[PDB]
Design a protein around this nucleic acid. Structure first.
Ligand SMILES: [Mg+2]
Ligand SMILES: [Mg+2]
Ligand SMILES: [Mg+2]
Ligand SMILES: [Mg+2]
Ligand SMILES: [Mg+2]
Ligand SMILES: [Mg+2]
Ligand SMILES: [Mg+2]
Ligand SMILES: [Mg+2]
Ligand SMILES: [Mg+2]
Ligand SMILES: [Mg+2]
Ligand SMILES: [Mg+2]
Ligand SMILES: [Mg+2]
Ligand SMILES: [Mg+2]
Ligand SMILES: [Mg+2]
Ligand SMILES: [Mg+2]
Ligand SMILES: [Mg+2]
Ligand SMILES: [Mg+2]
Ligand SMILES: [Mg+2]
Ligand SMILES: [Mg+2]
Ligand SMILES: [Mg+2]
Ligand SMILES: [Mg+2]
Ligand SMILES: [Mg+2]
Ligand SMILES: [Mg+2]
Ligand SMILES: [Mg+2]
Ligand SMILES: [Mg+2]
Ligand SMILES: [Mg+2]
Ligand SMILES: [Mg+2]
Ligand SMILES: [Mg+2]
Ligand SMILES: [Mg+2]
Ligand SMILES: [Mg+2]
Ligand SMILES: [Mg+2]
Ligand SMILES: [Mg+2]
Ligand SMILES: [Mg+2]
Ligand SMILES: [Mg+2]
Ligand SMILES: [Mg+2]
Ligand SMILES: [Mg+2]
Lengths: 99, 173, 62, 50, 158, 183, 52
RNA sequence: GUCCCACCCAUACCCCGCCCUCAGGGUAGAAACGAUGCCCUGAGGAGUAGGCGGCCGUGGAGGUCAGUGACGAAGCCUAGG
RNA sequence: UUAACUGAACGUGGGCAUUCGAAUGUAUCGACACUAGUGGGCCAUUUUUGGUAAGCAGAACUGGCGAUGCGGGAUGAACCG
RNA sequence: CCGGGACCGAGGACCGCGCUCUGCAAGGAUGCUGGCGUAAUGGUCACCAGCGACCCGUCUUGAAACACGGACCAAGGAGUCA
């Protein structure tokens, strides 16, 4: 929700357009039943039949550096004590710092 | 780090030739469940012919200390790798939880033998129920009868931003 | 004086700079290198097929 | 409005269903293995050199 | 050093252990058509019609059929481009390729699936999907009590 | 960094005529307006061809027009964004309505004498603003002496650069087996 | 001309999602669990947890 | 030696302003426009060898500015703009 | 070509989709023309060959410096960012 | 849901999505007030101060080099034409 609401940009005709209105989402994804930002969030979160189209419509999110920083050495795996790899549910704290 | 004991139960992926495979349980001391599952797969690779790709995690649970307010003596049997071989050693700790005993064990091994986390295998952690089964003198002197001691030459707490003091501090409290 | 003998150090990057071009395939390949007897027969087979197709429009009605 | 209301109800019901499936397995004396994750978020953390 | 035609073919062109001598005749009994996809595998006992060692282990398309050989089109990567090479290979070095058997069985399976779905009124899935993450399920420990494992102490075995 | 293969890539097509012809500029303005305000792809194609260099606008002859006037195209208006030339080999010019960038004197005279009609591109824009009932024709782009020299190399049968033609000019050693090898 | 964060600007939030006002008013973020006396964890589960 | 917390700062990341480049659109029954202009939107910016584009400056020629000038041209000096 | 319309190749006519037959991306597809500089390289991980070894000599893959600033390694072409 | 602080105010009639709808915090700052109205702000130069800063051109894998040319200044000075 927070990623889509704060850093949500659609790829409209090759341009990065902020998602400030439901009209943009309906215009670019209405053929798939997605006509609102809540529809886009639902499709992404539930991995619906049009997840490919929704995710590709979303311009790649451009996050800031985490507010609390990284671990002391961030280029090891999360298991080793770094930040790389799969941290599973623990990416939510990283997203909250980075977003 | 700050650890927590996890019961990790895993399983080989069921096949047509072997439905209902055997369930394997381990006790893992890890900072989090990701590391707990990683260590489980590492030890299961060591012991059985199961990998993470050919298996699955049936369960992960936290084993809390049942009496964290009771002082206990713990014996830890461990296997560790030095710079020139592998050794087994048994050590003792005085803590209120298995997690605290394991953390003290890691710190003590790092301090005395330069053993990193990667090179230590915790074979067994046991709470010594009695007193006569305490084997180390540094735990015996703590379980001595009517134990009491003073705290000599104790430095008083002074704020590090109070640069100058008008009288010389005392070390008798 | 002596110098370096040979190297392939940068060749992969140079090749991939503008892509590895794979000549596009076509519906009708060239009959070059095909058996000349087959080519000689195929010429007349095509002749007859075209003639029959034209007669079909002109009244043969196959 | 109606679609968002339905989505909120759906999210809450899915959470409660996961919780109750795990609880009922624990009560019956089995282990409920939850479904593996279907979505990931991936963040590039290193730079573009080397 | 040398750059002869068969340099470095000591093992590739050799026949395997206990694979020498008589050549099975199904090789000669096979038939090939223009457009067929064949695998090239050099037989060391047949020195006639031998393709160069580059084409050993390559897959191509038959473009010409002759008395005892087929012409095969291969694509060879030289520098920054691909070159279309045409090689005349005797049948003993040519094997029909299973590189398209999955697709050739899928096309007819999809045809029957389409006609059956049209008859039955419900659409089916024609395209293959990648392996998906496993679904939720319950594992009973009844008569399957978990076995607790611990790391083993170190000891010498010599 | 953003790690892009391409940055600041410029369009590879012309956006305006390199010519300084004032009437061509007026024609380009007219067809810019037409291509912006109409749905017809014909207007856009004409506008793009108005930018093109002379080698990209090869001449179209009356015989080439007559070839395409057959098979149900007799009543269509022929549109050529190029010069329309005469052809001596065509003895009988069919009746035709042609709009072209320019006509040679003989081509215009023969079209008018055959009962046909000659138009400029602005006249074409006036009568057929959407290009309805039009036949758009292009001349032979590769029919050029320079193209015969392009891509010269072994086994490519292109034309070499020679000062003269004869037995003493590029015909021995590399062109016949009696002189070592052929190409 | 100015990207406004819906998580800070409630007007933008209502523009994008009219259900946000109803969510806040009905306190759907504070829905408590359904009633019922919870069954206790089985002794077999506890024994397995503390087995080793 | 190991573990933990807070903090410091790169031209990197995030938000905003501006410059340029590139790209995509609008603009005539013209109350119309250095249309080679204006308006809207998005992204991008290291660089030797080298390529291309646009501009500044100098001697001379044609046209033009009814151009400047002994009431001071050109040149030269200038901790004045 | 076969004993033969029986095959080979190329087709005519008819039909398919209630779904063009994995994923992801497409922040670029293809063709052509003319031409610059370069054709002494060096460094590093892994694999190495010669050599006792070398800041030695020679190779494979990839990344770098050359052509490159900036923060860090006090100091530095290549190390870390 | 409440505070405390910092930097910023691009655009310039209306138009649109909207809301808690006589209006609004909704497609980008306004309202009120004070001092001065001049070297006050601001610019330029000289100097001190904190931090930073090797001599250019060239050949070169590599130049600040214990590599070569250059004491200084004015004028001339090198891809032209057929
Ligand atoms: Mg902070
Ligand atoms: Mg760090
Ligand atoms: Mg030499
Ligand atoms: Mg050399
Ligand atoms: Mg290129
Ligand atoms: Mg940038
Ligand atoms: Mg040849
Ligand atoms: Mg002779
Ligand atoms: Mg001779
Ligand atoms: Mg912006
Ligand atoms: Mg209860
Ligand atoms: Mg920018
Ligand atoms: Mg640049
Ligand atoms: Mg002169
Ligand atoms: Mg004067
Ligand atoms: Mg060259
Ligand atoms: Mg040479
Ligand atoms: Mg050369
Ligand atoms: Mg050298
Ligand atoms: Mg070397
Ligand atoms: Mg050397
Ligand atoms: Mg150089
Ligand atoms: Mg660099
Ligand atoms: Mg540095
Ligand atoms: Mg050095
Ligand atoms: Mg001042
Ligand atoms: Mg100073
Ligand atoms: Mg300094
Ligand atoms: Mg040297
Ligand atoms: Mg130098
Ligand atoms: Mg020196
Ligand atoms: Mg020198
Ligand atoms: Mg010299
Ligand atoms: Mg000197
Ligand atoms: Mg002079
Ligand atoms: Mg001079």
């Amino acid at each position: 929700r927070e990623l889509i609401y704060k850093r949500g940009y659609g790829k409209v005709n090759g341009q990065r357009i902020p998602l400030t209105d439901n009209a943009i989402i309906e215009e670019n994804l209405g053929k798939y039943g997605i006509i609102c930002i809540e529809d886009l969030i639902h499709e992404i979160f539930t991995v619906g039949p049009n997840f490919k189209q929704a995710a590709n419509f979303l311009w790649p999110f451009k996050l800031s550096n985490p507010n609390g920083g990284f671990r002391p050495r961030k280029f090891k795996h999360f298991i080793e004590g770094g930040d790389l790899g799969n941290r599973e549910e623990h990416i939510n704290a990283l997203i909250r710092a980075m977003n | 780090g700050r650890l927590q004991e996890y019961q990790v139960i895993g399983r080989h992926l069921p096949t047509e030739a072997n439905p209902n495979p055997a369930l394997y349980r381990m006790r893992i001391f890890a900072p989090n469940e990701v590391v707990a599952k990683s260590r489980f797969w590492y030890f299961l690779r060591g012991l059985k012919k199961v990998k993470k790709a050919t298996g699955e995690i049936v369960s992960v649970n936290v084993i809390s200390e049942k009496h964290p307010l009771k002082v206990k003596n713990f014996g830890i049997w461990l296997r560790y790798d030095s710079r020139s071989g592998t050794h087994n050693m048994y050590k003792e700790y005085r803590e209120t939880s298995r997690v605290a005993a394991v953390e003290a064990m890691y710190a003590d091994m790092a301090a005395r033998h330069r053993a990193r986390f990667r090179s230590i295998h915790i074979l067994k952690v046991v709470e010594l129920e009695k007193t006569e089964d305490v084997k180390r003198p540094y735990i015996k002197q703590l379980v001595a009868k009517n134990l009491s001691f003073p705290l000599p030459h104790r430095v008083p707490k002074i704020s590090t931003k109070k640069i100058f003091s008008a009288k010389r501090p005392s070390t008798f409290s | 004086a002596k110098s370096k003998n040979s190297s392939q150090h940068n060749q992969s990057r140079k090749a991939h700079r503008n892509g590895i071009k794979k000549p596009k395939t076509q519906r009708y390949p060239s009959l070059k290198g095909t058996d000349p007897k087959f080519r000689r027969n195929h010429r007349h087979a095509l002749h007859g097929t075209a003639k029959a197709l034209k007669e079909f429009k002109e009244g043969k009605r196959e | 409005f109606k679609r968002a209301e339905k989505y909120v109800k759906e999210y809450r019901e899915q959470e409660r269903e996961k919780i109750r499936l795990a609880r009922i397995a624990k009560q019956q004396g089995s282990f409920h293995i939850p479904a593996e994750a279907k979505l990931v978020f991936v963040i590039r953390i290193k730079g573009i050199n080397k | 050093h040398a750059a002869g035609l068969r340099s470095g073919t000591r093992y590739a062109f050799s026949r395997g252990f206990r694979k020498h001598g008589q050549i099975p005749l199904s090789t000669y009994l096979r038939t090939y058509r223009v457009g067929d996809i064949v695998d090239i595998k050099v037989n060391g006992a047949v020195q006639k019609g031998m393709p160069h060692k580059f084409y050993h282990g390559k897959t191509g398309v038959v473009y010409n059929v002759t008395k005892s050989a087929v012409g095969v089109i291969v694509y060879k990567r030289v520098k920054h481009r691909y070159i279309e090479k045409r090689i005349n290979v005797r049948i003993e070095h040519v094997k029909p390729s299973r590189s398209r058997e999955d697709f050739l069985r899928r096309v007819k399976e999809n045809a029957e699936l389409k006609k059956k779905a049209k008859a039955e009124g419900v659409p089916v899935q024609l395209k293959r999907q990648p392996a998906m993450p496993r679904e939720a399920h319950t594992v009973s420990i009844a008569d399957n009590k978990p076995v607790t494992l611990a790391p083993v102490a170190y000891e010498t075995t010599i | 960094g953003i790690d892009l293969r391409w940055k600041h890539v410029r369009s590879s097509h012309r956006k305006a005529p390199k010519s300084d012809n004032v009437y061509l500029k007026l024609l380009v303005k007219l067809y810019r307006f037409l291509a912006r305000r109409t749905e017809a792809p014909f207007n856009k194609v004409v506008l793009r061809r108005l930018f093109m260099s002379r080698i990209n606008r090869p001449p179209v002859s009356l015989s080439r027009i007559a070839r395409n006037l057959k098979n149900g195209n007799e009543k269509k208006t022929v549109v050529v964004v190029a010069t329309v030339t005469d052809d001596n080999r065509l003895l009988q010019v069919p009746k035709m309505e042609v709009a072209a960038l320019r006509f040679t004197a003989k081509a215009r005279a023969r079209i008018e004498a055959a009962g046909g009609r000659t138009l400029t591109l602005d006249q074409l824009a006036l009568e057929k603003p959407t290009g309805a009932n039009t036949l758009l024709l292009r001349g032979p782009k590769n029919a050029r002496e320079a193209v015969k020299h392009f891509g010269f190399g072994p086994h490519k049968h292109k034309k070499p650069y020679v000062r003269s033609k004869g037995r003493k000019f590029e015909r021995a050693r590399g062109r016949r087996r009696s002189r070592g090898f052929k190409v | 001309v100015q990207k406004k964060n819906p998580l800070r600007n409630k007007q933008i939030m209502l523009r994008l999602n009219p259900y946000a006002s109803t969510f806040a008013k009905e306190k759907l973020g504070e829905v408590k669990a359904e009633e019922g006396k919870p069954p206790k964890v089985p002794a077999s589960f506890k024994e397995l947890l503390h087995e080793a």
